[PDB]
Design a protein around this ligand. Sequence first.
Ligand code: SF4
Length: 298
Amino acid sequence: DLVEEILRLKEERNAIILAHNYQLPEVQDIADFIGDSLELARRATRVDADVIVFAGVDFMAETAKILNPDKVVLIPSREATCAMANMLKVEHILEAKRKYPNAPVVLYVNSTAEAKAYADVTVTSANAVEVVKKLDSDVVIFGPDKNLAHYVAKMTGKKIIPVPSKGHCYVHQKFTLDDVERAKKLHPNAKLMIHPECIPEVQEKADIIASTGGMIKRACEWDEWVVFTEREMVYRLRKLYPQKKFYPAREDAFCIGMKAITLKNIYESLKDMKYKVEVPEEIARKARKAIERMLEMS
Ligand code: SF4
């Protein structure tokens, strides 16, 4: 029985399990903390665990390691990867800095640790506007998501240059205006909670624009919601709010990287102490400074 063995090994390893909101229900049920990556990493800094098992994708485990350098961070599969974060290369950043002289470089926290090391500051979707409004530049380099960049440009009035120019999340790009229309026909009493990684024309139809943490916070505002994000979030919301209704905007909105994590490989991760996530000291130092600036600016 995986669950029993996982729980026993978690105690033996002095480990905590951090699960992203898109993890399967059976994985979330054995997690200590559930949320988005930055809040998970920060919550781990307040406990004296020796090991973090990160049920999530590579860049999220990296953020955990950046904020918890004295803990062993394990990712159950190195195939738990983020296509959007992987679109951005260091060369994209250096080239953009050359093309937009002196413009600040802002990195969405959904990004690799290496990319954060070239950032002046990081942002979450929830603090991106507040942070960017404090940059005294009409032009801002922003990556890796062009769709969040559009939202930031709209809310700040600044010229936001996405890096890379076509960076985006393939999961959230699946949502279309037809999915909006289908939702309104089938669920006329529902409101639409839409992730800022969705395309601009879909964002425009939202009742709320929110990351997963904001979806949980603002779900209290209505009794029925159609959810424009990765489909496992619906189960997360249903378990949090059993008396509300939540429906996926698309049944096929599936992050392959997130589903690389299984009960079986969480068991194997704890049993064998793999796969170790490391962040080079200099990259970690610079990524840490960009995260610290984000707190100072919000
Ligand atoms: S849902 Fe998109 S942005 Fe999130 S981990 Fe998957 S590919 Fe990356």
